[PDB]
Design a protein around this ligand. Structure first.
Ligand code: 6HH
Length: 284
């Protein structure tokens, strides 16, 4: 019941729009009493959307209580005059260091160290494993939706209607064509997306970045699986990319199987990498 939701008036304060417009009306927010920061997603509410939004709050409520998923705090309604429209504020954990895309763009040559890719990939997989256990498909895994805190903690955001978004991280099965008329999301679609996010960390951009989004959407189901440009990478990393990017989702490994991959499993400098990331964040 949305009637139970309070006005954010002396509770949460909006500071500024965060990212740019990558996430839309997502704001850096402040808890008025403690000054503690939060991420505030603002959306207009109509009487028809009352049960369409009730499930999005419930989704955040139920599944964000994992260390690799940005935690739900609460929900508020900023009422409008009788001539509409009400505003719903979804208050979340603030991942102050921004996204993985920001991290790659803020690194010289726009590439990340292989041990940094492995660490962040495992945190993506651990967050996806939690969602998949609960029978939830993220549906939008990409660098922009993988966030960092000040402590180099990796957290997932925006898990799941009018616009088709960016195609570059979309698995072949989610794109409708003549052989695949009913483009379906499988849990394994998040794994393809994870592999594209791993190329994005390695190369600074996803595989068909130079193509018009319409051309990329056409090519993803027809082209062979994308590959890393450089040969500098280890055998373990190419194998992980190959594992994520199995063209036919029916032979693609599960999240549990990818968590057992040597590239994700074998991480000795796990504590060292976390420090290096924290240090890179400190250089704002
Ligand atoms: N939970 C979050 N915590 C933090 C952010 C966030 C994103 C970007 C920035 C930067 C900025 O300050 O502009 C830092 C430097 C350049 C980017 C800062 C903070 C976003 C969300 C969030 C994402 C998606 C959704 Cl759907 C809801 C919330």
């Amino acid at each position: 019941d949305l009637s139970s939701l309070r006005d954010p008036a002396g509770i949460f304060e909006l500071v500024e729009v965060v990212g740019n417009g990558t996430y839309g009306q997502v704001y850096k927010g402040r808890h008025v009493k403690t000054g503690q920061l939060a991420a505030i997603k603002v959306m207009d509410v109509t009487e028809d959307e009352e049960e369409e939004i009730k499930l999005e709050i419930n989704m955040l409520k139920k599944y964000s209580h994992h260390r690799n998923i940005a935690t739900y705090y609460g929900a508020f309604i900023k009422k409008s005059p009788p001539g509409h429209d009400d505003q719903l504020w979804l208050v979340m954990e603030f991942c102050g260091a921004g996204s993985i895309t920001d991290l790659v763009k803020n690194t010289k040559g726009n590439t990340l160290k292989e041990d940094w890719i492995a660490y962040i990939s495992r945190e993506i997989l651990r967050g996806l494993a939690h969602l998949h256990i609960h029978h939830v498909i993220h549906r939008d895994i990409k660098g922009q939706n993988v966030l960092l805190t000040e402590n180099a903690e990796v957290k997932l955001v925006d898990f799941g209607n009018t616009f088709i978004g960016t195609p570059y991280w979309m698995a072949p099965e989610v794109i409708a064509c003549d052989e695949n008329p009913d483009a379906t999301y499988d849990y394994r679609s998040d794994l393809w997306s994870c592999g594209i996010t791993a190329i994005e960390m390695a190369e600074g951009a996803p595989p068909l970045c130079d193509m018009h989004p319409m051309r990329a959407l056409f090519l993803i189901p027809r082209n062979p699986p994308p590959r890393l440009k450089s040969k500098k990478w280890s055998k373990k990393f190419f194998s992980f990319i190959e594992g994520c990017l199995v063209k036919n989702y029916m032979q693609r490994p599960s999240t549990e199987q990818l968590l057992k991959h040597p590239f994700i499993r074998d991480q000795p400098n796990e504590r060292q990498v976390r420090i290096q990331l924290k240090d890179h964040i400190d250089r704002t």
